[PDB]
Point group: C12
Chain length 90, copies 12
């Protein structure tokens, strides 16, 4: 099964009314961060069980790497809100 | 395998009423951090006993690396409360 | 394959009326960021399922790498708006 | 060597009464730091005796690495308290 | 696969009337940034489909690398405008 | 081998009376530092003699690495006291 | 090969009338930057089509690296004008 | 000959009279630094002679590494005294 | 053909009249930068054509490295003039 | 080999009369720095002649590395006097 | 080969009349810088022609490395004069 | 190729009259810097001719490395004088 090619979607941009673009991009960024959280957790549950049953240092090592990424992605969720607070500021 | 594919859940966002998004995202981040705590510990207990019985420098090395990640992840839980404190504040 | 060769397209530039170029470049940058969001998500969905079923640390490792890039690229979106806020004016 | 899957437990969070969450999270973090101390020491005692008896630079090298992590993880306990002091401020 | 040698074209410079050079160089730089955007996107579209169909961590890894460069190169467009704003100052 | 499995021990935490936890954590951290001092020296004495007799650059290399870690771990002891001085209060 | 050896050209310098050296060196640097622009683009067009038709991660990887250098080199053109502006200024 | 296992020794700590702990830990740190100096010099003398007689770049390289560590360990001896001076300060 | 050995040339230095040394060293530095520019361009033209005709990622990669060095060497030409301006200053 | 084992010497320390420890430790550090000077030079003379006669890039490479360490070690001798000067001072 | 062994030469030092040593050391440093300029150029001319004729990426790679070192060593010449300006006095 | 062991010579130190030690150590440091200059130049002259005649990128690469160390070591001579100037202050 050859995967279906991606069809790109052009946004409508507003350089002289940027607030509406900023609103839209917040929604996009938020959506993506929720997606990442879901995907990382999904992978982690399986990677954990694989590592536990594998007596394989390699499996432990990649699980640790996954946790690292989960933490990084986690931290960015709160930073996003700080960034938005700053943007509404000056 | 073959594992059920992940079905993504699109959040509802509120760029002009962001406080409810912030509340929701705090709960999500906190949930995730608790999940990581549980997962890291579950892995660590098994990695430790495997390393102890392995007489294998590679096992000890990876265990040390796991401990490093556990520390890095654990540190962020209190950092998150500092972030939330600032988020409620002046900035 | 053989893929059609890329034909490059020249913009019209205005060094002494730069605001119009700045407007156009914002639209280009934002478009590319949306394109990247779309492409990263498309890759991630497949990479995730491949990694889940691979029974392979290598697959998980590259998936984590992909997530790292997704986060990095993602965080640049609000940075762009901060940049535009500073820029104008 | 066959393990039962991890059962995840959801915490209850309180975005508009965060202090009770902060209290609970301090207790979780401190617990985990104590766990890491215990696990690191447990590993170190065995890694030391293995390295002493192995006549193997590789064992010594990894024991040094372990001591490095022990120090790092150890340093974080007092940093936790400094963070909590700042949190209360 | 046999290519004609590059013929280099000399610009005319004006050390004591540099503003006309600066104008021309802005146009060249902006053109090149637009070219890079087009080339990166062109490569990305194909690299994505190859990675999706390869079931290969190596393809995913390199696609991530490409996205990284796309973001970096993309970030530089607005930086160009900030630089030009400072130049005029 | 098979080694007895580690049984983890939970501390009792006091988020609203943290000084008592801070006291206990200082004692734990100091104990671990003394333990590390003792273990590093124990390893070093054997690693030194092994390296002296090995006729092996690898042995000397890892011995130097061990000394580096010993110094790093060692220097943290007085840093701890500086940290405690800042902490209280 | 065997390519004609390079014959080096010694400039005439003026430590006590440096402005003419500065003028000359600006022209040289600008010429070189334009040459690099031309060379990088000429390479990029071919590297791109080779990478597109190669189904080869190595080709994509090196193309990305080439793009990185192109960005780094391209950035210096405007930085050069800033440098020249400062050179005319107070400092 | 299987080496005798290490028996760990618990210190007595005093969170509310820390000065006596600080005195004790200075003595421990000082002792260890003197130990390191002695061990590094002991290794270096042998590593030097081995390198001189080996026409082996590898031997020279590790001797250089040893000297690096000796210098680092050396520097920390004086820094220890500066640290102690600061601790008696405020 | 064994290359002719380099015969080194000692400069005359003037620690108590350093301005004349500074003039001379500017001329030397300038000469070298012009030499580098010429050599880098000379190599680049050939490296470019080799890369174009080689369908070899390795050739592209080294050409990119060469361009990196050309840019670095380029930037230093202008920095040299800034350095000289500063030296005539205080 | 088998070399005589090292017999460690425990110093007598004075946390409440630290000046005599400082005096002693200065003498020790200075002695060690002089020892390193002697050892580095002794090694360098032989490494140099070996490298000169080796027609071996590896020999030249390691010699360069040795020179690097010699510079780094040599620099610390005067840094030590600065440290001692500060130790006598206000801080 | 066997090359004549190097005979080291001791300078005469003056800790309580350092200016004369500083003068001599400036002359030594400047001499070495001129020597390095001469040696780098000598190597570069041959390395360039070798690289041009080698049909070998490795040759070009090391040539670029050589150019990097030439630039680094070259830029230190005017830094030296800045250093001397600060030094005296 | 058989060498006599190094005989270490103990200096006499004066913690409570440190200026005479400082004077002696300046002379030792300066001597060593002059020695390094001589050794580096001696090696460089031979490494250059070897690299010129080797038609070997490896020889060029290592010659560049040597020039790098020569510059670094060379830079330190004037830094020594700056340090001494600060010491007297």
């Amino acid at each position: 099964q050859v995967y279906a090619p991606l069809v790109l979607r052009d946004p409508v941009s507003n350089p002289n009314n940027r607030k509406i673009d900023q609103d839209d991009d917040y929604e996009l960024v938020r959506r993506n961060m929720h997606y990442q959280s879901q995907m990382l957790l999904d992978m982690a549950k399986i990677a954990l069980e694989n590592a536990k049953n594998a007596d394989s240092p390699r499996h432990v090592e990649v699980f640790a790497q996954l946790m690292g990424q989960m933490t990084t992605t986690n931290k960015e969720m709160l930073k996003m809100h700080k960034e938005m607070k700053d943007l509404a500021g000056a």
